[PDB]
Amino acid sequence: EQIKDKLGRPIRDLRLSVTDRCNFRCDYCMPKEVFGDDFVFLPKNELLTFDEMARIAKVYAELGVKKIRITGGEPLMRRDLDVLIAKLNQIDGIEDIGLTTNGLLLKKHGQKLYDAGLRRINVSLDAIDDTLFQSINNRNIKATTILEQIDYATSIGLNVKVNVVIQKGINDDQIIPMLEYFKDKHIEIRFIEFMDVGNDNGWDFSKVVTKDEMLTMIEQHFEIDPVEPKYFGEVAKYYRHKDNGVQFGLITSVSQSFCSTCTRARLSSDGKFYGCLFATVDGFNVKAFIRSGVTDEELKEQFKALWQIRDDRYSDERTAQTVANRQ
Amino acid sequence: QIKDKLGRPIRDLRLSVTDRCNFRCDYCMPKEVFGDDFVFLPKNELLTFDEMARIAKVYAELGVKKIRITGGEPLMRRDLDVLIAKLNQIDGIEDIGLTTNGLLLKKHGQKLYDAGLRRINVSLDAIDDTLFQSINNRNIKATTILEQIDYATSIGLNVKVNVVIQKGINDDQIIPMLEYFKDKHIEIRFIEFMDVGNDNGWDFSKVVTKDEMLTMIEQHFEIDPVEPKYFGEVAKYYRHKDNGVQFGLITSVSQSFCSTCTRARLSSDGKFYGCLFATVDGFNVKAFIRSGVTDEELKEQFKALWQIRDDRYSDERTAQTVANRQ
Numbered sequence: 001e002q003i004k005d006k007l008g009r010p011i012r013d014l015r016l017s018v019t020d021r022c023n024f025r026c027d028y029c030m031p032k033e034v035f036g037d038d039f040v041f042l043p044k045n046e047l048l049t050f051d052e053m054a055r056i057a058k059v060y061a062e063l064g065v066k067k068i069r070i071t072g073g074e075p076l077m078r079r080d081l082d083v084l085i086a087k088l089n090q091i092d093g094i095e096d097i098g099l100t101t102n103g104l105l106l107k108k109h110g111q112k113l114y115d116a117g118l119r120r121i122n123v124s125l126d127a128i129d130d131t132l133f134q135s136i137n138n139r140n141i142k143a144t145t146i147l148e149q150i151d152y153a154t155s156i157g158l159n160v161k162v163n164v165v166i167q168k169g170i171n172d173d174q175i176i177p178m179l180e181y182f183k184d185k186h187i188e189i190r191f192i193e194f195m196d197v198g199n200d201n202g203w204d205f206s207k208v209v210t211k212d213e214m215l216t217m218i219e220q221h222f223e224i225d226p227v228e229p230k231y232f233g234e235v236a237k238y239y240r241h242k243d244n245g246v247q248f249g250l251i252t253s254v255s256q257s258f259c260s261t262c263t264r265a266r267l268s269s270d271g272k273f274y275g276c277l278f279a280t281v282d283g284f285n286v287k288a289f290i291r292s293g294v295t296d297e298e299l300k301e302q303f304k305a306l307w308q309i310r311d312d313r314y315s316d317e318r319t320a321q322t323v324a325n326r327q
Numbered sequence: 328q329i330k331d332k333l334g335r336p337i338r339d340l341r342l343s344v345t346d347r348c349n350f351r352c353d354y355c356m357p358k359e360v361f362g363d364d365f366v367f368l369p370k371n372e373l374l375t376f377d378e379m380a381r382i383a384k385v386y387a388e389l390g391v392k393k394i395r396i397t398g399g400e401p402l403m404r405r406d407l408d409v410l411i412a413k414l415n416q417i418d419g420i421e422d423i424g425l426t427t428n429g430l431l432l433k434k435h436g437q438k439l440y441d442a443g444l445r446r447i448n449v450s451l452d453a454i455d456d457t458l459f460q461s462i463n464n465r466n467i468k469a470t471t472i473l474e475q476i477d478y479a480t481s482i483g484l485n486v487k488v489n490v491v492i493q494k495g496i497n498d499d500q501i502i503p504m505l506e507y508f509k510d511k512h513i514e515i516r517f518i519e520f521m522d523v524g525n526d527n528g529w530d531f532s533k534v535v536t537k538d539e540m541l542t543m544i545e546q547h548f549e550i551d552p553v554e555p556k557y558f559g560e561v562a563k564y565y566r567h568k569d570n571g572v573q574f575g576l577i578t579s580v581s582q583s584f585c586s587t588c589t590r591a592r593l594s595s596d597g598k599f600y601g602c603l604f605a606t607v608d609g610f611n612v613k614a615f616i617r618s619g620v621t622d623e624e625l626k627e628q629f630k631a632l633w634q635i636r637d638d639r640y641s642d643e644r645t646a647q648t649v650a651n652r653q
């Protein structure tokens with residue numbers, strides 16, 4: 001029931017990638033140069049079905065999983081996503097189901113999602129200036145559009161948090177406007193440090209605004225009290241606006257790596273297992289495993305086996321290398 | 328550049344130099360355990376200053392740049408100045424530190440300075456005179472150690488103060504001690520208390536975390552964060568907005584830092600440990616060296632001990648505590 005990996009970390013979260021498609025082409029994720037006109041995405045049948053996803057989640061739930069986060073791609077591009085949600089909403093032990101999206105399709109699908117049980121979403125928005133944000137998504141989408149979508153999602157009863165990845169030299173200046181806009185809207189926003197491994201290969205701080213620097217900027221425009229961790233392994237450092245009372249987080253993904261508390265399992269859109277967001281090599285083929293015909297007991301012992309040999313710790317590895325890189 | 332099983336390099340050597348002490352702290356060398364009964368290590372079963380020197384030279388070639396002298400109380404070791412001198416003559420040990428309870432600084436502090444000591448850390452767990460004797464159990468007033476800190480400063484020694492905080496015992500010293508050392512222009516640091524429970528996770532009942540520590544301080548003081556002085560700096564630093572004196576908070580438990588841990592350790596009886604915690608007896612350096620061995624062979628041996636190191640005791644606890652809840 002509680003299974004731990006080789007670093008003593010229990011399994012708690014399941015990340016389900018639902019598609020390899022996206023409606024954006026953001027330079028650090030799906031740059032046009034690689035996913036341009038030529039690129040073949042997965043054939044529809046090479047994706048896991050909703051039934052398969054639900055059966056996988058049922059079994060991980062028996063091994064201690066309690067949260068599932070839906071990702072892609074842009075998840076909202078996957079047709080009938082609401083059916084997935086309904087089926088995950090029927091699984092004992094799963095207490096939270098989240099989704100992250102760029103939000104463009106929230107007016108089109110939000111209600112169906114909500115109807116099937118979706119209550120929380122994370123929206124990725126890397127800027128609030130329209131011209132900057134188009135330079136980031138590369139698909140001519142205005143930030144104003146996404147603001148509108150966020151307000152729709154809110155209006156229908158979704159709780160919305162925003163995630164912002166900051167790259168020094170690109171969206172530095174988005175921090176204060178975005179803090180402001182979402183303080184107004186009583187919405188929790190979170191600024192994430194950019195992860196970029198140089199040639200050495202430790203962390204490339206060239207760009208890279210750390211939590212510490214970000215904080216220096218913030219405190220000059222807003223008056224703030226830190227907010228004590230709700231629980232023990234909690235990733236984001238939170239701070240409160242004295243006003244008001246509205247929270248925002250800072251995610252020290254590079255300056256202060258958190259592999260020691262990382263309880264996350266991942267299934268990719270092509271149905272393979274990964275024990276870390278980074279991975280150069282193909283994972284165990286869960287998809288082909290279950291398609292060969294297997295019992296639930298068989299699946300469960302395989303997921304258990306996969307977690308018990310997990311020792312991923314990519315960021316810590318980059319931190320140790322970075323330190324070693326001071327010869 | 329030699330690295331361990333977690334890609335951590337060797338950069339720091341901690342040289343324990345005695346097993347003796349002039350205090351008898353309840354939490355460390357209580358009179359129950361180390362009474363007047365106790366036979367400490369005989370002179371001859373301690374590493375000599377020459378083997379220590381020898382071991383530093385070799386570690387230095389594997390990348391060690393810093394040496395911290397400890398023990399129980401380092402200043403009870405014989406002619407500590409002669410060791411400090413020899414260590415100071417090795418390329419390329421850049422730094423030598425020493426942590427003491429400070430009692431003997433008026434006695435030995437100039438000898439040490441003359442020899443090359445420039446930096447020290449004084450352990451002081453209280454500033455209140457009554458409380459403090461209840462801890463050190465040898466009738467030593469905090470004020471006595473304050474005075475030693477002052478003398479050490481007067482002769483050029485750069486001083487820092489380490490306070491470990493336990494919840495039921497120490498709490499109320501945070502603020503007075505920040506006030507006293509802010510006045511004197513001395514960096515003080517408050518360390519979180521490490522203590523494992525039955526379930527083998529952290530025990531927070533005796534902990535005042537960094538985060539809670541900061542709420543007590545921000546009330547009494549006007550404060551700014553201070554950017555890490557370098558990636559993976561351990562102590563979180565803050566400064567008084569007037570004045571400009573910095574203090575530190577060390578998050579032992581609320582945030583394990585095993586991933587940056589580059590510390591090799593040698594005990595008073597001459598054993599190597601890769602971690603401050605460690606049940607089993609460590610590889611016996613004193614017995615090795617004392618047979619017939621060359622520098623190249625010593626180095627090979629240290630190089631091998633380090634390449635096989637996987638210690639991460641605090642992360643282990645951290646992960647367990649996450650597993651326990653629940």
Ligand code: SF4
Nearest residue numbers: 022024026029030073
């Ligand atoms: S929207 Fe998200 S998934 Fe799509 S390219 Fe941008 S970062 Fe990637």
Ligand code: SF4
Nearest residue numbers: 259262276277313315
């Ligand atoms: S780098 Fe991988 S192992 Fe570390 S916190 Fe991120 S997902 Fe977890």
Ligand code: SF4
Nearest residue numbers: 348350352355356399
């Ligand atoms: S002074 Fe230090 S070594 Fe001596 S008993 Fe106290 S804590 Fe232990």
Ligand code: SF4
Nearest residue numbers: 585588602603640641
């Ligand atoms: S617990 Fe051991 S490995 Fe971890 S930082 Fe402390 S001494 Fe180093």
